[PDB]
Amino acid sequence: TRSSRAGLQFPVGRVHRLLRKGNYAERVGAGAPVYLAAVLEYLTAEILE
DNA sequence: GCGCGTACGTGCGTTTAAGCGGTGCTAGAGCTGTCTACGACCAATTGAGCGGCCTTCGGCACCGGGATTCTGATGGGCGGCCGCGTAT
């Protein structure tokens, strides 16, 4: 389930919703919620340490 | 302020390559046309997430008890007080 299937530490089923409610393009590409959680986690980790 | 030094502006001549308009070629943008996959939407169920509320062990810095070391009144014995004092 999202983190699982994706294999990330970030919420994949949270940024998908905001990107569709922000109202960016007409519909949303399937690519992004998942990809978009990934880089975010990556940045998150780069600072903490 | 002043004074020394030199580098950077202004000139001419030499030189080098942009800009002009001439043609040719085909690549890659733009259009166009059909399919269908993927995202929005509506539904119903489920647990991740937020407020509300209070947890426990480890680490900084203040602490604890027991043997041991150093200071003080005590005391017999060898010496010195020279000055009042009794005896012949």
DSSP letters spanning A23-49? T-SSS--TTHHHHHHHHHHHHHHHHH-
Query: 10 Å Cβ neighbour count for A12?
Result: 21
Closest CA to A40 of A18, A17, A10: A10
Instruction: Please report the sign of the dihedral spanned by the C-alpha atoms of residue A31, residue A20, residue A17, residue A22.
Output: positive
- How far apart (Å, rounded) are the C-alpha atoms in residues A43 and A28? 23
Enter the DSSP assignment of A11. Answer: -
Between the CA of A20 and the C1' of B74, what is the distance in angstroms? 104
Question: Looking at strand B, which nucleotides approach a protein CB closer than 7 A?
Answer: 38-40, 48-49
Single-letter amino acid code for the residue at A30:
A
A29 class by beta-carbon count within 10 Å (0-12 exposed, 13-18 middle, 19+ buried): exposed
Contact by Cβ (8 Å): A41, A8: yes
**How large is the C-alpha radius of gyration of chain A?**
12
